[PDB]
Every structure is written in structure tokens, then in C-alpha cells.
């Protein structure tokens with residue numbers, strides 16, 4: 001029986017026999033062999049899609065929060081506090097509810113938008129609209145953590161990356177060896193960092209004989225790592241990776257460098273093409289940001305990057321049900337047809 | 351290790367060693383012990399939530415579609431077809447894509463509300479807006495199946511209920527025994543029927559020492575099974591159970607009678623309370639219809655139904671990410687607070 005990532009990989013995590021485990025059975029997500037997709041893009045090798053959208057709150061972030069909240073409970077924290085309007089906030093809230101802890105979200109009145117906060121809110125998170133600026137409100141978040149037993153779960157929390165490395169463990173456990181390449185979307189770059197650390201651990205332990213080349217992918221209008229300098233106003237339909245100054249920038253470059261990989265960019269058009277193709281070839285629905293990994297692969301295929309026979313794994317970071325707006329946006333118009341058998345058959349290719 | 355429900359429960363299904371298995375790794379969803387929820391509603395026993403929202407397309411229907419589509423391939427069908435605007439169509443489309451088959455959806459141009467078809471469409475379903483009624487489109491779908499190798503995957507397809515019975519197998523496998531009661535939402539009633547069939551099979555094999563009383567739940571504004579007569583214009587915010595003339599009506603009545611349970615109703619207000627409470631006490635986000643099961647449980651606990659010590663399982667049929675509109679609707683607007691630490695702290699109460 002699957003019982004969460006902490007119980008499965010406890011010997012690799014900063015926990016012990018007394019650490020309280022707050023889990024929603026995250027992890028152990030499908031590693032789907034995508035032969036239809038491979039044929040559709042002309043990739044002469046095996047493609048495996050790690051479908052993280054099936055995690056409890058719809059994002060791989062759950063891997064980090066289970067450990068982060070568990071450690072918080074162990075430390076006697078009475079609540080968690082966040083300053084995010086995305087998957088981070090929803091994930092932290094879910095685990096806080098599971099742990100019986102309070103969850104607080106402080107954001108500037110301007111960054112508030114119910115659509116992006118509904119999930120976190122239903123989890124029980126108390127959202128405050130700070131009548132001020134972004135950094136204005138982060139100061140308040142900081143002051144709370146310094147003065148009260150409230151756990152800050154921003155990027156600064158080291159347990160998030162630690163829990164996230166378990167995705168690499170699962171790929172290696174399932175395949176029996178590491179892939180030749182691992183494709184992953186890159187926003188704040190914590191995930192690519194985590195996977196690399198995960199692969200190195202299994203390698204240092206002798207569980208795998210080779211280390212995958214880490215191929216990270218950013219959206220064109222928000223590719224500070226690819227360019228080498230921060231992006232003031234990052235732009236991209238893939239909200240999850242719309243980051244101008246990634247928190248884990250340094251470790252991400254090290255991961256690409258050590259693994260012999262690279263962090264590159266793809267356009268929103270290429271991202272949407274992959275987003276749709278993944279669903280129409282394999283019946284796997286991920287969110288736009290997740291598709292960047294496959295879009296990256298498609299790009300390299302067309303450029304004649306591969307020699308043939310390589311094994312590639314792609315992280316589909318979030319559930320496509322996370323983004324109903326983009327889903328509706330890419331939908332063509334339903335073809336209108338008269339109530340006539342023969343006409344219908346005519347429209348269809350019969 | 352998990353490879354889908356067909357491979358896991360092959361001996362219980364109408365398949366042989368030569369049947370092509372089209373799977374998306376559906377099934378084996380978390381059976382979450384909800385102690386926080388139990389304490390929150392005063393239930394003096396054990397509550398387990400079967401979180402079906404984590405299935406590949408967001409609902410338990412994936413269990414039926416994996417078999418239905420696999421059987422269609424085996425039969426040499428070139429496509430699948432239905433006339434649904436809900437989870438049925440999305441599920442069928444995803445499995446058709448996985449199987450490399452085409453998927454067609456015929457619906458009256460009227461009911462066409464894009465948000466409800468976006469998922470089926472991204473999976474590659476070809477949706478036709480028929481300038482007629484539901485009955486006109488239904489006859490065209492029938493004529494298509496009688497004249498072409500296109501598999502009808504609506505309610506009449508027997509494989510859906512067969513694949514769905516695996517949910518009960520999983521519950522019994524995980525617990526090592528059957529629950530005293532099983533709470534489940536009831537729309538067309540195929541799921542309740544499937545679970546009952548599943549429990550009886552394990553009982554007959556001796557894998558369980560008891561048979562669960564089946565407790566089905568409908569929304570009061572659409573409870574034809576409860577009232578005994580079709581509901582011309584069913585109403586409820588829980589769209590997945592907004593069914594006025596359930597296809598498996600007779601089977602549901604039999605399941606309730608034979609198991610010693612019953613099919614009852616709960617108000618939308620009671621459903622929404624459950625929907626929110628499940629999320630805030632456990633960090634589990636299911637869609638409204640799914641919450642009907644817990645709402646039913648809450649109703650009975652308050653009415654003094656239980657005696658204490660009973661084990662109850664609840665099927666949370668769909669992912670909360672399936673219904674963004676209701677999620678936004680139940681959310682209170684964030685509280686506006688000045689950028690003053692003491693004020694913020696005063697608002698939260700530390």
C-alpha cells in the first residue's frame with residue numbers, strides 16, 4: 001500500500017522515528033510510456049511522462065509540503081504562512097488542514113484574484129488583502145515568523161526541495177536505471193535542483209549507473225536563466241513558470257552544468273502545441289507550464305539533437321484541471337450540423 | 351508497481367491474455383482515514399475517504415472507460431461515440447486518445463457550454479453541435495453504431511459498470527475487510543450498482559466477512575429515485591448528479607434493498623457544507639457531487655443513526671479542480687487590512 005513519500009523514502013529525508021507524518025498519499029504518480037506521442041513527434045526512443053498532476057492538490061509541490069508541514073508540526077508550529085497566489089499556497093493549505101494547523105496567506109490587495117486563490121481558500125486558508133505593496137507585505141510575513149510560532153513556507157524553506165527530490169527516486173525505482181535525459185519546466189528552479197540532487201543520491205549509492213542530462217525549459221518571455229539576467233516583467237501563458245528572478249537560479253545552473261544538460265527556452269506557441277499534443281496522443285491532461293518539458297523535447301528532436309534509442313523522462317508538473325482558462329482558450333469551435341444522419345456521417349470521416 | 355485496474359483485477363473482468371490493455375494507471379487512489387473530519391462532525395468511528403479525484407481524468411469514470419475502450423480495441427472498433435457533456439465524455443476521450451482511436455461527441459447546439467467540453471476537446475474529441483434536440487442526436491449516435499465500427503460509450507455500454515466495481519475491490523484490499531456502510535453519490539446510479547456487485551464478489555470469495563449497507567445520496571432537487579418518479583427538470587449545483595431519469599434506477603433500488611441500505615437525499619446547502627468541510631478538515635478537494643456522500647453521513651450522524659464504532663467509507667467521485675465555478679462561488683472575499691504589523695496580527699489573532 002502506498003503511504004506517502006516520507007514513509008517510502010524516510011531514510012533519504014531529515015526525519016526520524018518520532019517525526020509526525022502529515023501525508024495525503026502524494027507521490028507514486030504514473031510514469032507513463034508515451035509511444036503515441038513519440039510517434040507523433042518522430043522521437044526514435046522511449047518517452048516516459050511523470051504525471052505529477054495526480055498529486056493531492058494537483059501539483060508536484062505536494063512533495064515538498066508534506067515534508068515542510070510535517071517538520072513544522074515536529075517543531076511545534078501552530079500554523080503556516082504564505083505569500084503566494086499559486087500552487088504553493090493551495091498545497092501548503094491542504095497540508096496545514098491535514099495537520100490540523102491554521103494557514104495564512106498575506107498578499108497585496110493588488111495581487112488578489114479569487115480564481116487563483118479558491119483552492120487554497122476552500123482548504124481553509126485565511127487570505128488577507130494587505131493594502132500595500134508586495135515587499136510591503138513580505139515584511140509583515142517576516143515579522144510574524146520572527147515573533148510567533150508560525151511556519152513560513154516560502155521558497156526559503158529547505159524541506160520543499162528535499163521532499164521534491166523523491167520524484168527522481170520514483171523514476172529510478174520504476175525504470176530500474178536513470179534516463180539518458182530528464183526534461184523539466186523551470187520557474188523558480190527548485191524542482192530541477194531537487195531532481196538533480198535526487199539523481200546524484202541514487203548514483204552515489206550505486207542504485208543507478210549513469211546520471212541523466214538535465215534539460216530544463218523556460219518560456220521565451222520569462223527566461224532569465226537562459227538569458228543570464230533577471231526579467232523585470234516576465235511574460236507567458238504558462239503562469240507556473242512566469243518567473244523573472246528564480247529563487248534557485250544558482251543551483252539550477254549547477255545542475256545543468258554537472259549533469260551535462262542545459263536550461264533553454266521555448267515559445268508560448270511551442271508550449272501550447274505540446275500542451276495539446278500530450279492530451280490528444282496519450283489522454284494525459286497537464287497544465288501549460290508542465291507542457292514546456294515536452295515542448296523542449298520536440299524542439300531538440302526537430303533540431304536533430306538525438307542519435308536514436310535514448311530514454312527520456314518528462315515531468316508534467318501540474319494537473320490540466322488547474323487551468324480551465326487556457327483549456328477553454330485553445331478549444332476550437334464545435335462544428336454545427338443539421339439533425340441528419342447522412343449529413344453527420346458526412347461531417348465525420350465515414 | 352501499479353499498472354492499472356485491468357491488470358490488477360484481471361480475473362474479475364471480461365478479458366483474456368490477448369485483450370489489448372489501454373490504461374492510464376487509473377485506480378489505486380488513496381483511501382484516506384479522515385480523523386479530523388470524524389472529530390469535526392462527531393462521528394464516533396472510522397471514516398475513510400476514497401479520493402477518486404486523483405484518477406487520470408479527474409473522476410472514477412476512468413475505471414469504466416479503461417475496460418470499455420480496451421474492449422472496443424479488441425473488437426476492432428475505430429472510434430468511440432457518446433452524447434454527454436460531462437465527465438463521461440472527457441473520460442472516454444482520454445482513453446480513446448491513449449488507444450489511438452477517434453472520439454466523437456454529438457450534442458444539441460443548445461447545451462454547448464464550452465467550459466464543460468474543454469477537457470474532452472483537448473483530448474481530441476470531435477464535438478458536433480446538432481441543430482436539434484438531445485433525442486435527435488441520440489438517434490444519430492445509435493444509427494452510427496449500427497452502421498459503422500464505432501463503439502457507443504454511453505450508459506448502455508456494460509463494461510463501464512464492470513470496470514467501476516474495482517473501486518470496491520480496492521477498499522476491501524486496503525482495509526483487509528469491508529466497511530459497515532458505504533456512502534456514495536447517485537446520479538445515473540451506475541457506481542452504486544458497481545460497488546455492490548464488487549462487495550458481493552469479495553464476500554462470496556471470503557475476502558471479507560461482511561457486506562456493507564449501501565447508502566446512496568442524491569441532491570433533493572434531483573432525487574427521482576428517492577421520490578419514485580422521474581424529475582422533468584432536475585436541479586442542483588452538483589452537476590454530476592443532476593439526473594432526472596437515472597439509467598441504472600432499478601439496479602440502484604436493488605442494491606439498497608439487498609444490502610440493507612437506502613437511497614436518500616441531501617440539500618445543496620448540506621452538500622456545499624460537506625464539500626467545504628472535507629477540504630478544510632483533511633486537505634482533500636473533491637467536486638460538489640462527490641460531497642453528497644459525506645453530506646449524507648453528516649445527516650445520519652446528527653439524526654443519531656449510528657451507535658458508535660462503525661467503519662464507514664465514502665466515495666469522493668471527482669476532483670475539486672473539475673468545478674472551478676463552484677469553488678469561486680463559495681469563497682468569501684479576502685479581508686482588507688492596512689500594512690500595519692500589529693493590525694494584521696490583530697486581524698489574525700496571535
Ligand SMILES: *Cc1c(COP(=O)(O)O)cnc(C)c1O
Nearest residue numbers: 087187188189190191240317318
Ligand atoms: C511551481 C510549478 C512549476 C515551477 O516549479 P519550479 O521548481 O519553481 O521551477 C512548474 N509547474 C507547476 C505546475 C508548478 O506548480
Ligand SMILES: *Cc1c(COP(=O)(O)O)cnc(C)c1O
Nearest residue numbers: 437536537538539540541667668
Ligand atoms: C458520473 C459521476 C457521478 C454519478 O455517478 P453515477 O454512477 O451515475 O451515480 C458522481 N460524481 C462524479 C464526479 C461523476 O463523474
